[model samples]
Target: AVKLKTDFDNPRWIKRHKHMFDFLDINGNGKITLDEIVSKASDDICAKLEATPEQTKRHQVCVEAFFRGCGMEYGKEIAFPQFLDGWKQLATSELKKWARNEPTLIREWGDAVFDIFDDGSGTITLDEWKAFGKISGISPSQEDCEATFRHCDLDNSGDLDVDEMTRQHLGFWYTLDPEADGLYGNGVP
Candidate 1:
């Protein structure tokens, strides 16, 4: 249980996300609109990151979902502060939903994780995990990923096997739920 929620209060975490936001705000206009996200979705991100088509699509979907969850009108501009608030709001809601349906969410997460298990070796390496995180928007820092990897490597092995994957997914969702309540305790506002 790495207490992922604490990252929201961590200066380093805020800095990382702020850097990402500034990078995405191409015009330095202090606002990021849906149009800006869409226009630069592939170019600014996929091109630079060499993301796959699926990753690019997922990025777009996540951006769209973020704006929708924030109740912003289509094409409306979102200030940097508002965007950060909306990002946390959306993540909290989604994590709460996942916490309520642990089995289903775990299965879904496992499936997604396994999809990127490119080696067919029944395990995920750190590189693979980082790639998955980036595409799926988990976006954990390299340090966080290493910490999580160490936590889940129960066998002291270098990679994450299926069992570890399941545990990792569960821990991630639980950590997001601050109170560690599997049933929405202190998760929803």
Candidate 2:
């Protein structure tokens, strides 16, 4: 029920969201498969974490919640158009409202990627982000990752807490301003 700054018709936002799609597309196949989503924090990737059993469990739970929040269909692939629609349909602003009167869905996803993003620090750095991206399937360029990371580095802390990280992801879809979202691809430095 919150106001939206960008919609499917906005080309500037469209380009930013498309970068988000490409990040998830992983294989450059133009479609994000359920398999692709799963592999992002797959057992192999998990093994690298040396995470405890509880951490692994929470990580998986958040991943599932993340997919559900995306409104993705089980066993299906999500293309750009579907991804964009889902982006609007479950804007982070809306989720905040839902969580205000509720819990779990959005809150869980807040930690999902955080579970993957943090490399021992409570905050995230460019290297940690790149490692997460690499494990998720993309060999992202250092510059791309830096721009994306800096986009949301609001305090210029040289790192981001979960609040900033979540906002970056939200800005990727919710803000029409090009400089607003760091998680968005090829962003300005």
Candidate 3:
């Protein structure tokens, strides 16, 4: 089995993972419900992932397996601490190993950008980006989002396409690893 190289105990990584938790807690309830996970697995968010019907089915199975393996009830809410442990298990699972690859990471991140933006416009606007940052607990300043958006827009189009968003996603991941550590502590495990 492959072990996660991340120092999950590191404070920096903790903050980053906390942001991820905030994003997944769709209702801002400080806990993740099974329904929330199911919603993300279904067509609503699966479309963002470019998932085929078969892939979507597989994803649903995997989600169920996660809960089953953790001895968690399907309808129960999971708090952050337990969710973190479950996340670590899922991340390190052999079933999810393909997700660690660069291309897969980029694709998944691009999909996640759509999920975060959620305007159904196929491109991310500044306002949508700002909303994403706020929801993810970043609360970036308008100036900061503007600068980053400009840097990421690539073609100065004032909105981000999938390729541009993927680039920015990878950039953020790399930025979080300034020490050149192999851990990549941006929550990929």
Candidate 4:
């Protein structure tokens, strides 16, 4: 019984999500399968919200929309950062809509949004967040993700703390505007 509410940031969390991880990483190549893009995207979105798998399906439309909008830049064979970036932007955009129209889902969405930046650094670095996101089917541009990590790694400490994590996560939300809208215009509202 891996309660996502607790120990989510623990290294053991990987063990807790082993089943889901395996399902997403169908290729057994230590990465998620692009073919299962929609499914993985949904899972990542659900994981973010801490919503039950069943609850996630309820918002299938939102998940699918994000997947489709990802376009060829994040098609079947997504690699590192591009895949994650695509999904993050897509999820952020859709979440805003869902939050506005379906206020009840806001809490769930907020939890998910925050989860993507679990480290609490206000940003999601390539290695820390994007890599995890890739496992969930939201791949990103490897270079971009890496660059983000390199830039934010102020002390060159080569590690992450809660504050850094929060900064990275929030930075994404504020800068990218995944929904294509201006900062704070999308789901952050």
The alpha-carbon deviation from the true structure for residue 92 of candidate 3, after best TM-score superposition, in angstroms, is 4.8
Error of 1 at 21 (Å): 2.3
Please state every model's RMSD to the true fold in angstroms. Answer: 7.8, 4.3, 7.8, 14.8
Ranking, TM-score, top scorer first: 2, 1, 3, 4
lDDT of 2 by residue, 1-189 (tens): 223365557776677668668867756999886566665655756657565677777776777666766666557888888887776766754546544655435555666556655645557677777776565544346777776666565445677677665555445446554445445354322
For candidate 3, the TM-score is: 0.47
| Model 4 bad stretches (over 4 Å) | 1-36, 43-62, 65-113, 116-127, 133-144, 151-189
TM-score of each: 0.48, 0.69, 0.47, 0.28
Looking at candidate 3, the ten consecutive residues that score lowest on lDDT are 180-189
Between candidates 2 and 3, the TM-score winner: 2
Give me the runs in candidate 3 sitting further than 4 Å from their true place: 1-7, 19-30, 37-74, 89-109, 112-123, 131-141, 150-153, 156-158, 167-175, 179-189
What C-alpha lDDT, on a 0 to 100 scale, does residue 7 get in candidate 2? 58
User: What is the lDDT of every predicted structure here?
Assistant: 0.54, 0.62, 0.53, 0.42
On a 0 to 100 scale, what is the lDDT of residue 10 in model 4?
35
On residues 47-83, what C-alpha lDDT tens digit does candidate 1 reach at each position? 5556577766655665555456644445788777787
Error of 1 at 60 (Å): 3.3
Error of 3 at 93 (Å): 6.5
Winning model by TM-score:
2
